[PDB]
């Protein structure tokens, strides 16, 4: 009844997973992860890559696949009682997104930042690259989409047309593929050194600012709460 | 670590490191290890690399597993960037204090301005002990002696916490009240402005005045303690003293130089011609940190990294003494797994198939002549 | 004026001016005053200053209180920019004609390309007379001799007035009528186009044709008188003849060099070592236009600016003759109010605490050796 600790899943699922990761690199950062031309890299680190990409395509196909088919067809008439329960679960999806972004855009990002300072890169595939770009980012993008779709398929208001701020919020993440990938790409001609002030990194900054579309998304979410028959009891009682 | 993946010809024709030496192979926390040697900036410096107008003498390690206590190019201490001059040879000396227990592959590298860390040979050095043992003491011109490991740590923390707390305090004050869906709607139908009132705007300026106040108080309080302070010292050191080398007595001419496709060896046809007056033999070809020796002629004692030293890697078609006045053409082959391991073989992907090295010649009584060669290096597949 | 506020180390390590001389201290309108001297571009030129690839030999005064009749670096007249070469020493000669009565502090300065006017010492020179006396005659390759003070003045004026008047004439023609609030409203409700008609659009093209006409008439009329004309001559002069200096016979080594915080003096510990063959003594340290002398050893006669000459500013711990072959370490102190007045003391705010000067040594029969020193200069507060 109402909004459960199905939420506690959402918070701990990343926390545990990513804390296992931080341990995992923590021990193989040094050991295998230093010299990429050693065969212990092609097993502890490269295989890790292929594993995750595959797992991501799959879970993405399953996760989006699931929700799009369990899209509520008879949305036209379902109670305000559930138009709340659902609105709340949607908010859990957003907490999961925001948490997922934290890890990607703050944690593993500025971590890679430190890593560059301490070893000259042997590949575009350092440990922290395997984790920052090809694990961390796909995850928060998948979470992103999930939420979007949940809202579109589960709640009226959001079922009517496309939310521009919500589209920007989930597509910005996805556009950071080359944006953050041009980091090392762009910086190679004029200056190969990974200077974060270089124009090559400006795409990451622009796509990072698309996270501010969360403000427009939350405004629309709270308007979906008010349309669903809420915000009138205690609001008027105030 | 980090060479290998970088362009093989960049590595051949950028900086040549030789007469490298390391005072110890195993060292206790807080102990010193001293790296010495020489480096030559190659006359045919690559276009893609800004000339070293502003270069920096760095150290190639996994972070501060050692701290650099001192560094010297020529006689001079080099904490800044420095202007090195193409063609010239210099002697450097890095002095490292050990800080983190472990096995470190320490390199000596150049921070070569516009594009490139120019990484020298790396040698494995082992630190034994506890990081908790490490001290980094420094005495100021101000009287006090401090430990750089922890100096000013608590201060940093305080001021960040304090300000952080105040940030929280501010959002905290507003968040005693409900935050979103009521305040949103109030703004909507009808006016807001019931949302904020007196008991609010007094606190607003409370904060505002309190903040400016604490900043200025704090600042001129920080000025009261610590009244003697300088700006960050910076700026490229010019006038680096280069090494005065005697004109070499041997001259060599590189006619064709080839490498086998899937291979581990580079052949070159040299005309060595011995001016000056003592029968000379060829003892080493140094190329990209990789050193190839004729052990019939020369033997490393400096403990040069084992993966880069090819003990009898270098074979000369005729390495008998070359008499003074005499001049001969000889076929030379530098061969060793290191050629594939450090990817000099990856020259086949480079846009400029030209190599560059140092040859070392030795006379009868064992004093040496260094000539430098460079030439196009051509693949052979069939 | 304008040094003093500029970075103390820039001023120390950029251009050294010495053997300065000024032919007169007081001068009548239309009279000449000639500045001579030498300057060395410091080998350790600062990074923040584009090398003098394109520099200009200027004069430091309040406008054309003098006009520069001639300027010479090496033998050559230098009206353009010129390429000076780091490390080299040159002799210059500026020749000034007086134009405005008064007291002028004239400096000799370098226009040093990418960031910086490099201002030399300034000397006070007095002009007596009337500006109405000044002439600046010049004879053309065209026959005529003109006065640059007023040449082409009336012409300039005419053409500006004429065109200006026509601009007025045009607004004038339209402003016989009412300008705003009726014309605005007419456009508004209903159409405009009653506002402009025939008697108007004839004048419009009257003006338009008249203008093109007068321009082209005027131009090929200006081409008829003045048929011989060149383009602005411009472009950096290369190949500046530097001065051929004999290798110095003394060599010095700067071990530590310090200055007191609130102070007026810089100490340095030099190892002077006298190669060449006559007992030598130290007579001057020149630093940033400021000249410090041991008057037991040397006396300025050139009338060097009084605020920059420290008559016995320089004291050597032992300034007895240094015998040939002998070599000694000595403590030297350059001391004078000028150190605080010209703000060399403002080195404490600079990001590069390194100084640079010229030392001048004199043998028994009074012929001199110039060595240049530079080194880090370190503060002491306690």
Automatic annotation (TrEMBL), chain A:
Report TM segments: 6-24, 44-67, 88-109, 129-151, 163-182, 202-223
Where Zn(2+) is bound, by residue? 112, 116, 129
Q: Name one GO molecular function term.
A: monooxygenase activity
Keyword entries, A-Z: Membrane, Metal-binding, Monooxygenase, Oxidoreductase, Transmembrane, Transmembrane helix, Zinc
Lineage top rank: taxon:
Bacteria
Name of the protein in question:
Methane monooxygenase subunit C2
Record organism? Methylococcus capsulatus
Where is the organism placed in the taxonomic lineage, from the top? Bacteria, Pseudomonadati, Pseudomonadota, Gammaproteobacteria, Methylococcales
Span covered, complete protein: 45 to 282 of 289
